[PDB]
């Protein structure tokens, strides 16, 4: 009967000179801490029990107390940063790393879970877990010919912890550790379990969220085609991180963006740009905005795949944040695109939704839309057709909005709008 003990009784049991009494009290503590209704984590910490749990981690001759104390410590380390810090300050990191090699799979799984929580807290604890030498034994746990012979939950916990070692910025994980972990992530990215795939995609999205050198580390391993395939998954928990990784990658150079395009990503965007999940739509439109900031042949790839009508659609009706990403996409398209491509954009109906967005209460989207209008007018000048575009803008109500913006609080707004009026509506 280790259910519902008081903290005083747990302390009495853990301070007894009786390994079995200590074990029973430790299990009682684990059960307290694993209740979803406000676990008394802080009371356990104040009782001074973390050092006792950490010392129990080292009793190889009593694996049950190793297991129970590991689980109690894991439940503490899954809370606030101060509670994770309490666990770390007790010396738990090297003890859990030593337990990674346990012959009891449940104990090593508990150690994997604990190190995942600790490393997930933040950059400093992540780098400290790495310094204590966790990566080698972690990856050795996965050194089997077929991942499918491992228990499902075990492999899932390993993948989650590895993703947490790839997580957080300022600073990003050490390049050495990233290189050490990447091959295993590449293997996990091909494993048939939705949760393993989701967490591998999350790890990749963490590693690609940075300068082009990190992106390049990831892209050199050849994972972009697999990322696109997973972009096409039906499980939203897979699509979300896969799309995040692809967007990150296209924030890089034009060659990395081209690697995304060559893998077939664009063919998936009709659905992504109409996805019923608002965040999928927003991230797909952000990815598109970065693609249309590339070379003219990449804008042309966007055109060939019939995605300009979907950007018109998103601009016309979507969550306002998605519409802002779409305005960005249009401004980049018009800034980098050929005359023919801007003409095509107009022929797809961009002008009316573009104008309708000028009544928004957001200054940045107004600046972006005015930049797009100026670029389109530049193309029209190059074609000597500013009157046609002026009439088009005037017929859908854009001229009223621009003349109203001429008197806007922001300096840039009234400047750009006055320029447009004087230049093409006089």
From Swiss-Prot:
ARM repeat start and end residues: 1-40, 41-80, 81-122, 129-173, 175-211, 212-251, 254-293, 296-338, 339-385, 386-425
Main location class: cytoplasm
PTM field: Ubiquitinated. Deubiquitinated by USP22; leading to stabilization and increased activity.
Tissue: Slightly detected in brain but not in cerebellum and skeletal muscle, highly expressed in testis and spleen.
GO biological process: entry of viral genome into host nucleus through nuclear pore complex via importin; positive regulation of viral life cycle; postsynapse to nucleus signaling pathway; protein import into nucleus
Region annotation NLS binding site (major): where it falls in the sequence: 71-167
Domain characteristics, as noted in the entry: Consists of an N-terminal hydrophilic region, a hydrophobic central region composed of 10 repeats, and a short hydrophilic C-terminus. The N-terminal hydrophilic region contains the importin beta binding domain (IBB domain), which is sufficient for binding importin beta and essential for nuclear protein import. The IBB domain is thought to act as an intrasteric autoregulatory sequence by interacting with the internal autoinhibitory NLS. Binding of KPNB1 probably overlaps the internal NLS and contributes to a high affinity for cytoplasmic NLS-containing cargo substrates. After dissociation of the importin/substrate complex in the nucleus the internal autohibitory NLS contributes to a low affinity for nuclear NLS-containing proteins.
Quaternary organization: Heterodimer; with KPNB1. Component of a complex containing CSE1L, RAN and KPNA2. Interacts directly with CSE1L. Interacts with PLAG1. Interacts with APEX1 (via N-terminus). Interacts with FRG1 (via N-terminus). Interacts with ARL4A, CTNNBL1 and NBN. Interacts with ANP32E. Interacts with SNAI1 (via zinc fingers). Interacts with SNAI2 (via zinc fingers). Interacts with BAG6. Interacts with AIFM2; this interaction likely mediates the translocation of AIFM2 into the nucleus upon oxidative stress. Interacts with RSL1D1.
Record's function text: Functions in nuclear protein import as an adapter protein for nuclear receptor KPNB1. Binds specifically and directly to substrates containing either a simple or bipartite NLS motif. Docking of the importin/substrate complex to the nuclear pore complex (NPC) is mediated by KPNB1 through binding to nucleoporin FxFG repeats and the complex is subsequently translocated through the pore by an energy requiring, Ran-dependent mechanism.
Family label: Belongs to the importin alpha family.
Name of the protein: Importin subunit alpha-1
Organism: Mus musculus (Mouse)
Gene name as annotated: Kpna2
Residues of the full protein shown: 72 to 497 of 529
């Amino acid at each position: 009967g280790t259910v519902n003990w008081s903290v005083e009784d747990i302390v009495k049991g853990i301070n007894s000179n009786n390994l079995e009494s200590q074990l029973q009290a430790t299990q009682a503590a684990r059960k307290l801490l694993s209740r979803e209704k406000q676990p008394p984590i802080d009371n356990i910490i104040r009782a001074g029990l973390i050092p006792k749990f950490v010392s129990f981690l080292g009793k190889t001759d009593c694996s049950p107390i190793q297991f129970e104390s590991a689980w109690a410590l894991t439940n503490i380390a899954s809370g606030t940063s101060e509670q994770t810090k309490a666990v770390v300050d007790g010396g738990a990191i090297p003890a859990f790393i030593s337990l990674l090699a346990s012959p009891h799979a449940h104990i090593s799984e508990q150690a994997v879970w604990a190190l995942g929580n600790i490393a997930g807290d933040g950059s400093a604890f992540r780098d400290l877990v790495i310094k204590h030498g966790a990566i080698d034994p972690l990856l050795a746990l996965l050194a089997v010919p077929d991942l499918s012979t491992l228990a499902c939950g075990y492999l899932r916990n390993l993948t989650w912890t590895l993703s947490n070692l790839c997580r957080n910025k300022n600073p990003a994980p050490p390049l050495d550790a990233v290189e050490q972990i990447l091959p295993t992530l590449v293997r996990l990215l091909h494993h048939n379990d939705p949760e393993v795939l989701a967490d591998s995609c999350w790890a990749i999205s963490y590693l690609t969220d940075g300068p082009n050198e990190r992106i390049e580390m990831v892209v050199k391993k050849g994972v972009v085609p697999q990322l696109v395939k997973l972009l096409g998954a039906t499980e939203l928990p897979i699509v979300t991180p896969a799309l995040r990784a692809i967007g990150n990658i296209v924030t890089g150079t034009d060659e990395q963006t081209q690697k995304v395009i060559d893998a077939g990503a664009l063919a998936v965007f009709p659905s992504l740009l109409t996805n019923p999940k608002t965040n999928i739509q927003k991230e797909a439109t952000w990815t598109m905005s970065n693609i249309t900031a590339g070379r003219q042949d990449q804008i042309q790839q966007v055109v060939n795949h019939g995605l300009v009508p979907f950007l018109v659609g998103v601009l016309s009706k979507a969550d306002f944040k998605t519409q802002k990403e779409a305005a960005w996409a249009i401004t980049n398209y018009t800034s980098g695109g050929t005359v023919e491509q801007i003409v095509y954009l107009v022929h797809c109906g961009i002008i009316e939704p573009l104008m309708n967005l000028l009544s928004a209460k957001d200054t940045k989207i107004i600046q972006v839309i005015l930049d797009a209008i100026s670029n389109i007018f530049q193309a029209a000048e190059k074609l000597g057709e500013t009157e046609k575009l002026s009439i088009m803008i005037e017929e859908c109500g854009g001229l009223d909005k621009i003349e109203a913006l001429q008197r806007h609080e922001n300096e840039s707004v009234y400047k750009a709008s006055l320029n447009l009026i004087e230049k093409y509506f006089s």
